[PDB]
Structures are given as structure tokens and as C-alpha cells.
Amino acid sequence: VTFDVGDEYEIIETIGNGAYGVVSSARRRLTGQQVAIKKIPNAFDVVTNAKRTLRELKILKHFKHDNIIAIKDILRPTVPYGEFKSVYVVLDLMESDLHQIIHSSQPLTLEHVRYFLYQLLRGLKYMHSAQVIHRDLKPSNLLVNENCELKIGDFGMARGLCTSPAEHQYFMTEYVATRWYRAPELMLSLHEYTQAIDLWSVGCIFGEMLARRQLFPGKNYVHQLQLIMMVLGTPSPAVIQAVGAERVRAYIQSLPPRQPVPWETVYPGADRQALSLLGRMLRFEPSARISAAAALRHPFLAKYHDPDDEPDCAPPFDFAFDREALTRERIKEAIVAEIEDFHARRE
Numbered sequence: 001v002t003f004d005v006g007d008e009y010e011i012i013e014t015i016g017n018g019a020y021g022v023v024s025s026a027r028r029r030l031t032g033q034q035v036a037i038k039k040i041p042n043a044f045d046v047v048t049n050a051k052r053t054l055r056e057l058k059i060l061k062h063f064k065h066d067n068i069i070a071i072k073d074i075l076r077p078t079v080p081y082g083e084f085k086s087v088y089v090v091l092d093l094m095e096s097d098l099h100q101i102i103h104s105s106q107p108l109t110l111e112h113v114r115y116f117l118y119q120l121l122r123g124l125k126y127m128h129s130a131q132v133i134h135r136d137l138k139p140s141n142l143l144v145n146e147n148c149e150l151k152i153g154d155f156g157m158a159r160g161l162c163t164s165p166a167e168h169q170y171f172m173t174e175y176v177a178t179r180w181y182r183a184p185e186l187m188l189s190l191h192e193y194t195q196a197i198d199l200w201s202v203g204c205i206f207g208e209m210l211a212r213r214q215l216f217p218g219k220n221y222v223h224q225l226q227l228i229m230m231v232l233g234t235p236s237p238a239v240i241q242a243v244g245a246e247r248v249r250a251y252i253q254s255l256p257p258r259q260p261v262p263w264e265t266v267y268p269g270a271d272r273q274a275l276s277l278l279g280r281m282l283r284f285e286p287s288a289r290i291s292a293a294a295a296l297r298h299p300f301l302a303k304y305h306d307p308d309d310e311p312d313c314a315p316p317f318d319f320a321f322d323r324e325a326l327t328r329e330r331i332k333e334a335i336v337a338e339i340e341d342f343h344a345r346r347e
């Protein structure tokens, strides 16, 4: 694969990406239009890596939404099949991300928070209606371009409402995603894994935008539970019983019963409607949390809310392919079939 005079793309420079790491900022040499090119090296060498490549390709090809990262192109194999070893994915060019924005000397007024939260929830309403749970939402995974467009990226951890018992995370839910943004159901293995997982992460991100500091920056497993309880208080007897691990259950039962700290105390002088919505997201019980679609209907987002401009995704996405136990070679065949289908649907 080359990027010379006769080739489709011109490599401008190597840049960073909060969701996908090292990418090449490039221009489609025919239009001059800027894009990001992600090389997935040795894509077929490791089962879990090849499975991730196929999962992301299928999820991104399923979605067509301005708040979700899109595939602009996929380079076809330029060598014989046996030699095809690295995949080149052409994506929307996104210069920054919410992590970089929050944690810099850039302005981040209440209006910036309101608009970024709106875009995130808009993308989530669509994703969630397709039966897709991101499971790893965090400010670095929320790409932001020069036109202030926010796009959800990195679907590596994404799953449906049904998962395979064959994969390790099915039991080891406390290792699903990132500690600082991990929903209590994942941390405690509460056997209730729905789109509600994402709304806890949204809450953590929303709080972080408001204070420009991480809300629950736990140093380890217990410290993470500790920090959550210092604000939310002691979990109810019902969730304590649903904790299927004696040591965790016993550490919770060991500290003094604590009352929830009003959000207005955690964030002094912050906007009322903002804390009203924030409180609806950060609840221990996944069934207690407001949904992405109900959140779009909240007064805090009334400035941007337009139901005719916040679509659902039809039909739902099917994770059956991912539940299959495929060899590295059968995954390679499925990825090559995805690339061919991408181009077949274009012409």
C-alpha cells in the first residue's frame, strides 16, 4: 500500500487520536478533502484483535449518524490474499477530543457543556435504539473536530443485550471498560447489563465537564467504590444482596451508613437544571437512571432539543457474528467480506 502521485491518498502527518491512537492525517488526492487513516497492523495475527477489527467494522458500517464516527473508505487488499496482513480504515478527521478540551486552557462555559452533552446524548439515543451498548464512554473516546462536532468512537468494548459465556468479561464484569467511568453494575456484577451502563458514564463525563476534573478518580477497586459512596451514599440492601462476591459485600457492610451528598454540594454554584439532569444519571440502580432519549427531553437540553432531528436506528444491530467461535483465518475471511461489501454498496 502506497500514498504517492498515482495513489488515492496523500499522507500529511502522523497525529494522535483519543479513540484509535496513531492515525495519519491525509487528503483524498482528487478532492483535497482531509481524512484520518488508521492502519490496523498485523490485524489477523491474534484472535481477540481480529475479532475487535470485525466488530468495529460492522458497528461503524451499521451506523450513519453525525454524532458517531464514520468509515469514509476502506482500502482494498493491494497484494495476494495470503499476503494481506494490515487493514487501512479511512475515517472522519477529528483533531481533538473531550479529554484534551476539558483538560486545557480552552474555554468551557456552561454553554460548551450543554452543547457537548447534547451531541453525546443525541448519538447515544441512536446507538441505544439499535440495541448497542458502548460500555467504554469516556472523554478521550468522544472525538471533537474543528467544526465543534462531537463523534462517539472506539466500539471495541461494545456489546448487545446478549453476550457469549465463552468470553472472559461475561464473569469478570469489573474489568469491562475504564475504572473512573465504570457503572456500579459492572463493578459489582449486579447481573443487569443494559444501555443504563452508558448513562452512568455520561453522568461521570457531564460532572467532569462541569468541574473540569474527574468525578470518581479511584486509585484501585475498593477506592473506586469508596469515592462513589462518599457522594451517592451507602447502596440499598437490595443492591448489596445482588453483589455476588463476599469480600466486596463485606467491605460495603463494614463502613458507617452514609447519606447521599446533594449534587449542589459536590458542585457549588453550578446550574440547577444541569444538576437536576446529572442526578437522574448517577444512581446505583441501572433501572433508576434516566435513558438517553428521556435526557434529550430534559429542560437542561431544551435549547438544542428537536425530536424530528434526533433519530433512532433501524433495524437493530446483531452481535451473533461476534458470539461465534471463529479461528483467526475465518475472522480474516469475514473482514475481507466486510471490505468487499463496503465497496459493493458504493457501486
Ligand SMILES: CC(C)NC(=O)n1nc(N)nc1Nc1ccc(Cl)cc1
Pocket: 019, 020, 021, 022, 038, 040, 049, 050, 052, 053, 054, 056, 057, 060, 071, 089
Ligand atoms: C490502538 C488502537 C486503540 N487500536 C485500534 O484502533 N484498533 N485495534 C483494532 N484491532 N482495530 C482497531 N481500530 C479500528 C478497527 C476498525 C475500524 Cl472500522 C476502525 C478502527
